[PDB]
Design a protein around this motif. Structure first.
Motif, PDB file in Angstrom:
ATOM      1  N   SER A 100      33.786  35.709  42.328  1.00  0.00           N
ATOM      2  CA  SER A 100      34.180  34.557  41.518  1.00  0.00           C
ATOM      3  C   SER A 100      33.585  34.627  40.111  1.00  0.00           C
ATOM      4  O   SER A 100      34.213  34.208  39.145  1.00  0.00           O
ATOM      5  CB  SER A 100      33.753  33.250  42.202  1.00  0.00           C
ATOM      6  N   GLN A 109      38.878  30.369  44.912  1.00  0.00           N
ATOM      7  CA  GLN A 109      39.219  29.284  43.995  1.00  0.00           C
ATOM      8  C   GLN A 109      38.096  28.249  43.918  1.00  0.00           C
ATOM      9  O   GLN A 109      37.743  27.776  42.834  1.00  0.00           O
ATOM     10  CB  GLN A 109      40.526  28.611  44.429  1.00  0.00           C
ATOM     11  N   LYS A 140      35.826  27.327  40.787  1.00  0.00           N
ATOM     12  CA  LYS A 140      35.887  25.981  40.221  1.00  0.00           C
ATOM     13  C   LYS A 140      34.468  25.454  40.015  1.00  0.00           C
ATOM     14  O   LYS A 140      34.179  24.807  39.013  1.00  0.00           O
ATOM     15  CB  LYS A 140      36.663  25.020  41.126  1.00  0.00           C
ATOM     16  N   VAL A 174      41.879  25.717  37.761  1.00  0.00           N
ATOM     17  CA  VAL A 174      41.740  27.034  38.380  1.00  0.00           C
ATOM     18  C   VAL A 174      42.635  27.056  39.605  1.00  0.00           C
ATOM     19  O   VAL A 174      42.563  26.166  40.447  1.00  0.00           O
ATOM     20  CB  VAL A 174      40.306  27.310  38.860  1.00  0.00           C
ATOM     21  N   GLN A 175      43.474  28.077  39.712  1.00  0.00           N
ATOM     22  CA  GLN A 175      44.368  28.165  40.848  1.00  0.00           C
ATOM     23  C   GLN A 175      44.614  29.604  41.274  1.00  0.00           C
ATOM     24  O   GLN A 175      45.076  30.434  40.490  1.00  0.00           O
ATOM     25  CB  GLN A 175      45.695  27.483  40.524  1.00  0.00           C
ATOM     26  N   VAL A 176      44.281  29.891  42.527  1.00  0.00           N
ATOM     27  CA  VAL A 176      44.472  31.208  43.101  1.00  0.00           C
ATOM     28  C   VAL A 176      45.723  31.167  43.957  1.00  0.00           C
ATOM     29  O   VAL A 176      45.848  30.340  44.863  1.00  0.00           O
ATOM     30  CB  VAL A 176      43.287  31.604  43.970  1.00  0.00           C
TER      31      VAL A 176
END
Ligand code: ATP
Ligand code: ATP
Ligand code: C69
Ligand code: CA
Ligand code: CA
Lengths: 281, 167, 137, 341, 400, 236, 174
Positions: free
Chosen positions: E285, E324, E328, E349-351
């Protein structure tokens, strides 16, 4: 791999996986696959009307009518029996497998399916190997355009069956690399005196074509003379398996020849760069 | 042969006399620096082009200039297969001219392969070794071209046999 | 961009400018039949067409000198070459390179033999003067 | 006595008055100064101002000033202030690379040959405080490769790519005056072409005046060495070599020359005043893959001691990054067949 | 497109995906290896096998030509293509355009070398060398989270070699901002192999890696919290400890073992590399956030809102969720300190996780090579002939 | 203080005048100045003492444009550059390796037939790329606007028309006093290219073709070694 | 990252730079009495299997130092517990292991010496030694009921499996 295989792996692995699942009791997965084979062949494997318990394998050949004129339908019916059904629109032959009603030895039909293409070709050869044997001479020879610009002629004579190929070399140089290969085929009997005899002409068509023969600096004519020991019922299949892969066998090796030369060039060029960089302090 | 040793000898002496270069800033363009033999924009900086022939097929063209020398080689090509093998090989090397920093991407018209040796090369490398490389190169491409020829033929025979002996 | 097609440099006033008959046919032929080579070579290396713009007269001299070099006997080359003075070797070296430009029969086989001998007498420097010449055969 | 300063080329060099330090160009934009300490060399300065490769390099002995020229078209006079060298820009007014430079013996002028087919004679005007220059143009038709001042600081020898060795008058009455008549002529107004070689081929890589100025010698790319004698109506003795082209040359006596070039080794030439002829005196370097001390072309030679009238030691620098010191005395004893002058 | 579908090849560090354009799944998926014999006279150069048939050949040596690190053996690759074409796909090479995928940040020289083989040896009528990341992005347009085409996004490709974090803007990769992570499917399998050695007995020695790889693909997943997970396991071992069996080659018998903590511990190394790698400790991340932060300011949000997965090593359940969330936290935390240091509008934030993930690249490649566009942009045999291999240096972008 | 659209008693932008400060440092009162920096390129004719707002023209192509073009060019050769992210990196490449071609046809032959123009440049991340023909392709924008898709004639032809629209009693003074100024005028060969370009134009549109009368065409483009504008203020 | 103690209090006492946390125990020592449902020994055991994999641990409170010490000691118990054959024999050896004079901050053999403060004098020394021992006897007692599967003579393989891992690559025996 020197000789080219005769069966389509995609067909076999697609059926094999489905059968393995049908026999295991799992619900059927949908299948949609488009693929090809040499000589512009196009296959299609799918579920007619979305019914997943049904798997259809179809093959398309632009020159199918020509094979039909030589017992193609009758032969395919013998081999595939009930698995043969009306052809899928756009294809010439279709095999159908009911996942809910499979034979005891599945692995057996899986292999016959993988030979669909070769079996579409089988009849033209069986017809003339049959003439030759029944001494029936004067029968019209067959003309099969396996490619847009290539042709195969089959004619039966008193003591032999001739298979002539009118193949094309794209790269003008490929003609030369090819002449080298055909030359060794020409002298083949010095390696196997019982093997078929191979003749080769460049630009000029053989007598066995006396018919719209294509003259050109890139057209090659390869004549295979098959004898009874090659055409009788006992050798017939293996012979057909070989002879029908010949044209792709020749081009396959020409290309692999160039690949081997590229490695030679990499080794030599590399050797030079070593000597050059050694010229540095 | 009876005529190879003498040919290469003449070529070697000629290359040694031609590989006498120095750094030369352009005289025609403000702050440029170009291989004079390529741009030819100053007649007085070009030396006389000379040729060395073994016969009417095999020869070498050597073009001097104050800061660079172009060397073109007419390779021995006895037959058809030899002609295409040579062309494929020269091309293969030229595609890699950047790693072969003394090769030219295209040959002077009339030749099979051309070198462009500059003062920068002769500064960074012993010029007598570059001379050796050219001679070495000349001898080795004939051998390689021969090995390739045998290689094709040998593989062609085994291939014909393999197919024929299965009937 | 019509103007970028005329090489104005062509009329530049800095463009450097170089400072602007042959052997006696019968003389050499005589020496040749007359008896011996060495004199023939000297007669052939006489009065070279270094100042004539005529490619024909230059090729004329070339043919003469060449004929002599071929008429020679592999083993008489060294002796003859050694009779020449430095300036002679230099001029001979120039004819040998001009020879290399016209392969026919095995003339190159012999020219390579002469090059070896000329090189032994004049050294690599004689080749340098082949490249350096602004006026040539 | 060979020493490697780098594996790359020493484009050019120059020694200070007592040959205590040497300035070399490591084939780049800078000038490194080395000083001897015992039997070792120690780098002591770095002159980074040129924005192009340094081509020329000279050191005015008495005033202890270094002058440099490069392909960036500039010349800089370096003056040592305290413990660092400071550069003063000289506008040469040339639109092409500078190729060589030399201070006149009187240290009040310096000449720069360039690709503009001109020679830029520079001097200082202490009034407007800076360096100016006059151009010697005619009849130069190509890049000037080398220069050498005559002992009277007025006559200048120059070699160019138009295959000529020429002697020009460099008279700058703003800092000196009426040069005494010389065997090359009595009239020396600025730019006066006093002499021009006759050869029409071969780039002249090096030129050199003899100790007393009556003789000038030059080496060309056509593998020949020449000498003109003013005390003999400017007659020119010529000698064609069997080897590769010489790139540098200098007298070691009034009748002896030492040159070096692409053969990678120093050789000797002697001039027979009476016969008006030059002779090959032999190889001075007597035995990678070479039997020579330098492993690449020698492009510069300079007298270390004894001057050009009785040189006892000389220096060579080449494309191999090597710097060699040669002792005339030791050479004569190691090569008993050597005959100088 | 003409009569026949184009050929699509995606050669990975560990596996190669082969098939014809138009299909949703590759027709072949085989190990990226080749087994050779070791002055090649005769036809020895043809005596080789690839894929599964090349793994345990008695008299042949296995070789893995594709792998981040060592120089590429073109002889091996060229040979490899011979069988890919004439043995598996069974395509007349002169009748099919080909799409091949290149490794991230591949040099243009390597493209010319590939074109030399394809055009000079196989005489193909057309070639297209594709950038994996673009195909990955395209493959994702298949998601229900993203219903609008876009080639701007952050690709996380984790397969068998090294996981890549590649940022793409309007279709062009920002190569200077690429970063890789020393953790992938092979690293995870090795880790599960070590955990199993410490506990279970009976696992056949020469099958140690095999069993691990299997446990990984059948039983692993990414949990939301370690202690809690561990607790679930020790609390009710009945609904968490699984069983795994296999047959030992030398006895052809079945051997069984308990599968435990390894289930969630294996994939955890994406988030805590220090668990199995002494040299790397940066959590995935953070690498992602680090990468995006290095990109142009004005493209950072587009990248955060479209982080796309690709590769078999991203198939672990809840991989996208875990990533994600952790991303975040890092982002929200940073935005906080800035506000608490004086109003940055919250960063979305978007996976994206989609169904065509395992073979994202091949699938993307298949779909692209099935469009009319593909045939127009693609370099032809005539172009290669008239201009040379340099044309293959640049491969036009399209799809949007 | 000399203010710059990209870098930094006070210089003033065309249309103390910067054009005059330049000529001033050269000890000149008349002459045409070609100033090309990071944003725009101007052509400022200055007559005995001070500028002339009229006749002064401008070119919508300069530094930033050449840097941008070089980025596109390197992308077409397989290098994955980002226009916003690597702008500074390619700018440095531009400054170190780019230059102006004298004879384009000749430059294309060197790039296409040899490897003499090929230079290596190490990127910040450690990767090594190779730049050759694009070294002279990027700046060519200055002479062929259309290459970067900009309408116009190119600094050279533009410089020609400026001096042609001038008095006939000044045309000579101007022609023999064209001075360059600006970081974007330092590409090696720029001065030479202008001169060749101007002679071509002159021979075509003035001498109409009378080649023999060209030799007496006084063309001297002053390319002094030194940011002349700042220099000008200093002295004054 | 790793799991940290949350028992630190604005009123928690210290012995060296370690936090003298309370424990519900009957063994003797300076540990404050614990009333809450759980303590520092419980916290360490709950976090063990997770923490033991970590290599880097950031010390936030003095509570983390006590937490780390117990974590390292748990490892010690597993090494010994592993070779046991009954919850009973295990409890026996937990006492015997709890009594051994392990190294303490400032001493050679005690890892993390750069992190733990050395006892300032002979009193702090005895009290610290007493608090560490107390923690050991108590930790060792609780692990047993956690380690031996309800079916005695079976130290769970789910505990034994950790016997080779080392928190922060450290050891109280190394
Ligand atoms: N469901 C799954 N969960 C976790 N891993 C899986 C799963 N399925 C496959 N894998 C792993 O995926 C890996 C192979 O991935 P893939 O083939 O897509 O990458 P690759 O292209 O070979 O490698 P790379 O793209 O880095 O060159 C293997 O380690 C395989 O064990
Ligand atoms: N040596 C060089 N060769 C080519 N371009 C250069 C060189 N040095 C700088 N540049 C470019 O020139 C431009 C900067 O020019 P200058 O420094 O004249 O700009 P400025 O004066 O700040 O702006 P302007 O001149 O547009 O007001 C930038 O694009 C810079 O990259
Ligand atoms: C390590 O060996 C390789 C070298 C190069 C490549 N390829 C390329 O550089 C261009 S596309 C890819 C490739 C893929 C298959 C066959 C060939 Br030939 C080339 C390659 O595929 C990733 C592998
Ligand atoms: Ca992949
Ligand atoms: Ca400015």
């Amino acid at each position: 791999m020197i000789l080219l295989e005769v069966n389509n792996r995609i067909i076999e692995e697609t059926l094999a996986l489905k059968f393995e699942n049908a026999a295991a009791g799992n619900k059927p997965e949908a299948v949609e696959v488009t693929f090809a084979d040499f000589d512009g062949v196009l296959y299609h494997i799918s579920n007619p009307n979305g019914d997943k318990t049904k798997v259809m394998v179809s093959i398309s050949l632009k020159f199918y009518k020509e094979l039909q004129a030589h017992g193609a339908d009758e032969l395919l019916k013998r081999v595939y029996g009930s698995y043969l059904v009306n052809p899928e629109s756009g294809y010439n032959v279709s095999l159908l497998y009911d996942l809910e009603n499979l034979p005891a030895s599945k692995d057996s039909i899986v292999h016959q399916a993988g030979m669909l293409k070769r079996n579409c070709f089988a009849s033209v050869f069986e017809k003339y190997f049959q003439f030759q044997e029944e001494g029936k001479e004067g029968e019209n020879r067959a003309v099969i355009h396996y490619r847009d610009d290539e042709t195969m002629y089959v004619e039966s004579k008193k003591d032999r069956v001739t298979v002539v190929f009118s193949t094309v070399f794209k790269d003008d140089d490929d003609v030369v690399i090819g002449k080298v290969f055909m030359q060794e085929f020409k002298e083949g009997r010095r390696a196997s005196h019982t093997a078929p005899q191979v003749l080769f002409s460049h630009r000029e068509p053989p007598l066995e074509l006396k018919t719209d023969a294509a003259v050109g600096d890139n057209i090659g004519y390869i004549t295979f003379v098959l004898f009874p020991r090659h055409t009788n019922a006992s050798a017939r299949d293996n012979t057909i398996n070989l002879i029908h892969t010949f044209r792709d066998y020749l081009h396959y090796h020409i290309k692999c020849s160039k690949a081997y030369i590229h490695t030679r060039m990499r080794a030599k060029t590399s050797d030079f760069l070593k000597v050059l960089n050694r010229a540095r302090p | 042969t009876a005529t190879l040793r003498p040919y290469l000898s003449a070529v070697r002496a000629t290359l040694q006399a031609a590989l006498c270069l120095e750094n030369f800033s352009s005289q025609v363009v403000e702050r440029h620096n170009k291989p004079e033999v390529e741009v030819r924009s100053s007649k007085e900086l070009l030396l006389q082009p000379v040729t060395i022939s073994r016969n009417e097929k095999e020869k070498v063209l050597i073009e001097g200039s104050i800061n660079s020398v172009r060397v073109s080689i007419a390779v021995k090509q006895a037959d058809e297969i030899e002609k295409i093998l040579c062309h494929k090989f020269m091309r293969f090397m030229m595609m890699r001219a950047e790693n072969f920093f003394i090769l030219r991407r295209k040959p002077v018209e009339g030749y099979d392969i051309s070198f462009l040796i500059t003062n920068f090369h002769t500064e960074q490398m012993y010029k007598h070794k570059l001379v050796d490389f050219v001679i070495h190169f000349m001898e080795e491409i004939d051998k390689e071209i021969s090995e390739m020829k045998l290689s094709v033929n040998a593989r062609a025979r085994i291939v014909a046999e393999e197919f024929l002996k299965n009937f | 961009a019509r103007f970028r097609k005329v090489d104005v440099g062509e009329y530049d006033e800095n463009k450097f400018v170089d400072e602007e008959a042959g052997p006696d046919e019968g003389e050499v032929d005589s020496c040749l039949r007359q008896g011996n080579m060495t004199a023939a070579l000297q007669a052939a290396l006489k009065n070279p067409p270094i100042n004539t713009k005529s490619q024909a007269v230059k090729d004329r001299a070339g043919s003469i000198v060449l004929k002599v070099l071929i008429s020679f006997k592999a083993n008489d080359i060294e002796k003859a070459v050694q009779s020449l003075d430095k300036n002679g070797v230099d001029l001979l070296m120039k004819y040998i390179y001009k020879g290399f430009e016209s392969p026919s029969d095995n003339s190159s086989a012999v020219l390579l033999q002469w090059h070896e001998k000329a090189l032994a007498a004049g050294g690599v420097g004689s080749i340098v003067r082949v490249l350096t010449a602004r006026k040539t055969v | 006595a060979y020493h490697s300063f780098l594996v790359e080329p020493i484009s050019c060099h120059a020694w200070n008055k007592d040959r205590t330090q040497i300035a070399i160009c490591p084939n780049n934009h800078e000038v490194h100064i080395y000083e001897k300490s015992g039997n070792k060399w120690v780098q002591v300065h770095e002159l980074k101002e040129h924005n192009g490769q340094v081509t020329g390099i000279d050191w005015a002995p008495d005033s202890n000033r270094i002058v440099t020229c490069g392909t960036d078209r500039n010349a800089y006079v370096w003056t040592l202030k305290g413990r660092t060298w400071k550069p003063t820009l000289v506008i040469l007014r040339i639109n092409r690379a500078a190729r060589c430079v030399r201070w006149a013996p009187n240290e009040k002028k310096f000449a720069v040959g360039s690709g503009s087919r001109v020679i830029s004679i520079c001097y200082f005007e202490q009034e407007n405080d800076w360096w100016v220059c006059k151009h010697i143009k005619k009849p130069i038709r190509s890049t000037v490769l080398s220069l050498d001042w005559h002992p009277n600081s007025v006559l200048l020898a120059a070699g160019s790519c138009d295959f000529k060795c020429r002697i020009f008058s460099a008279y700058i009455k703003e800092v000196e005056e009426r040069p005494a008549p010389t065997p090359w002529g009595s009239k020396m107004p600025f730019g006066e072409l006093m002499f021009e070689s006759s050869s029409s081929c071969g780039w002249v890589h090096g030129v050199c005046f003899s100790a007393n100025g009556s003789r000038v010698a030059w080496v060309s790319h056509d593998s020949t060495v020449c000498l003109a004698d003013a005390d003999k109506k400017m007659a020119v003795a010529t000698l064609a070599s069997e080897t590769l082209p010489l790139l540098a040359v200098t007298f070691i006596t009034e009748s002896s020359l030492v040159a070096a070039g692409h053969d990678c080794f120093p050789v000797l030439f002697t001039y027979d005043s009476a016969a008006g002829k030059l002779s090959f005196g032999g190889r001075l370097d007597v035995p990678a893959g070479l039997d020579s001390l330098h492993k690449n072309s020698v492009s510069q030679i300079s007298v270390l001691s004894g001057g050009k009238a009785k040189c006892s030691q000389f220096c060579t620098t080449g494309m191999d990054g090597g710097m060699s010191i040669w002792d005339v005395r030791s050479l004569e004893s190691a090569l008993k067949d050597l005959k100088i002058v | 497109a003409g009569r026949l579908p184009a050929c699509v090849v995606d050669c990975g560090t560990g596996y190669t995906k082969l098939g014809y354009a138009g299909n949703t799944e590759p027709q072949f998926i085989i190990p990226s290896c080749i087994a050779i014999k070791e002055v090649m006279k005769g036809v020895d150069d043809l005596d080789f096998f690839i894929g599964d048939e090349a793994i345990e050949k008695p008299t042949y040596a296995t070789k893995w030509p594709i792998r981040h690190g060592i120089v590429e053996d073109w002889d091996l690759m060229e040979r490899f293509m011979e069988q890919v074409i004439f043995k598996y796909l069974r395509a007349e090479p002169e009748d099919h355009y080909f799409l091949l995928t290149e490794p991230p940040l591949n040099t243009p020289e390597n493209r010319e070398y590939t074109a030399e083989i394809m055009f000079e040896s196989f005489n193909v009528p057309g070639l297209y060398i594709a950038v994996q990341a673009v195909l990955a992005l395209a493959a994702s347009w298949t998601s229900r989270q993203v219903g609008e085409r876009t080639l701007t996004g952050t690709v996380i490709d984790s397969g068998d070699g090294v996981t890549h974090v590649i940022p793409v803007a309007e279709g062009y990769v920002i190569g200077s901002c690429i970063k890789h992570i020393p953790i992938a499917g092979r690293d995870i399998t090795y880790f599960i192999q070590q955990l199993l050695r410490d506990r279970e007995v009976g696992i056949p020695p020469e099958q140690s890696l095999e069993t691990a790889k299997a446990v990984k693909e059948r039983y692993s997943y990414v949990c939301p919290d370690l202690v809690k997970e561990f607790n679930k396991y020790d609390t009710d071992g009945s609904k968490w400890i699984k069983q795994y069996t296999g047959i030992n080659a030398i006895s052809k018998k079945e051997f069984s073992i308990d599968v435990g903590y390894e289930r969630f511990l294996g994939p955890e190394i994406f988030f805590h590399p220090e668990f199995a790698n002494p040299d790397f400790t940066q959590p995935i991340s953070e690498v992602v956030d680090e990468v995006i932060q290095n990109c142009p300011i004005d493209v950072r949000r587009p990248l955060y809102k479209n982080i796309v997965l690709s590769g078999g090593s991203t198939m672990f359940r809840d991989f996208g969720r875990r990533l994600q969330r952790d991303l975040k936290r890092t982002v929200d935390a940073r935005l906080k300190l800035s506000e608490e240091l004086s109003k940055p509008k919250p960063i979305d934030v978007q996976v994206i996780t989609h169904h065509m993930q395992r073979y994202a690249v091949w699938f993307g490649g298949s779909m692209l090579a099935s469009t009319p566009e593909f045939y127009q942009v693609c370099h032809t045999k005539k172009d290669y002939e008239e201009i040379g291999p340099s044309i293959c240096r640049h491969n036009p972008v399209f799809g949007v | 203080c000399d203010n710059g659209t990209g870098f930094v008693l006070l210089t003033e932008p065309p249309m103390a005048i910067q054009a005059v400060l330049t000529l001033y440092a050269q000890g000149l009162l008349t002459g045409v100045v070609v100033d090309s920096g990071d944003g725009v390129t101007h052509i400022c004719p200055v007559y005995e003492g001070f500028s002339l707002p009229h006749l002064t023209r401008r070119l919508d192509i300069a530094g930033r444009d050449i840097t941008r073009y070089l980025i596109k060019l390197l992308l077409l050769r397989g290098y994955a550059f980002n226009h916003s992210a690597d702008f500074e990196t390619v700018r440095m490449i531009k400054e170190k390796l780019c230059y102006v071609g004298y004879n384009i046809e000749q430059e294309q032959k060197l790039a296409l037939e040899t490897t003499v123009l090929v230079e290596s440049y190490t990127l910040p991340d450690g990767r090594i790329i190779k730049v050759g023909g694009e070294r002279f392709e990027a700046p060519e924008a200055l002479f062929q606007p259309h290459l970067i898709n900009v309408e116009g004639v190119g600094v050279a032809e533009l410089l020609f028309n400026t001096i042609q629209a001038a008095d006939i009693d000044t045309r000579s003074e101007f022609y023999k006093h064209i001075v360059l100024s600006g970081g974007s005028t330092m590409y090696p060969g720029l001065p030479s290219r202008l001169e060749r370009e101007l002679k071509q134009l002159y021979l075509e549109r003035v001498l109409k073709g009378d080649v023999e009368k060209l030799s007496k065409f006084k063309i001297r483009i002053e390319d002094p070694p030194r940011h002349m504008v700042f220099l000008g203020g200093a002295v004054l | 990252p790793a799991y940290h103690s949350s028992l630190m209090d604005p009123d928690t006492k210290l012995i060296g730079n370690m936090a003298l946390l309370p424990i519900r125990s009957q063994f003797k020592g300076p540990a404050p009495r614990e009333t809450k449902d759980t303590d520092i020994v419980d916290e360490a055991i709950y976090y063990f299997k997770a923490n033991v994999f970590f290599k880097n641990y950031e010390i936030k409170n003095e509570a983390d130092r006590t937490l780390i010490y117990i974590t390292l000691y748990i490892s010690e118990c597993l090494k010994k517990l592993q070779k046991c054959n009954s919850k009973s024999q295990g409890e026996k050896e937990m006492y015997t292991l709890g009594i051994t004079n392990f190294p303490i901050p400032g001493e050679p053999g005690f890892p993390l010496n750069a992190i733990y403060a050395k006892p300032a004098n002979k009193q702090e020394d005895e009290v610290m030694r007493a608090y560490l021992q107390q923690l050991r006897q108590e930790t060792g007692l609780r692990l047993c009921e956690k380690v031996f599967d309800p079916q005695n003579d079976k130290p769970s393989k789910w505990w034994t499996c950790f016997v080779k891992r080392q928190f922060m690559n450290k050891s109280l025996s190394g």
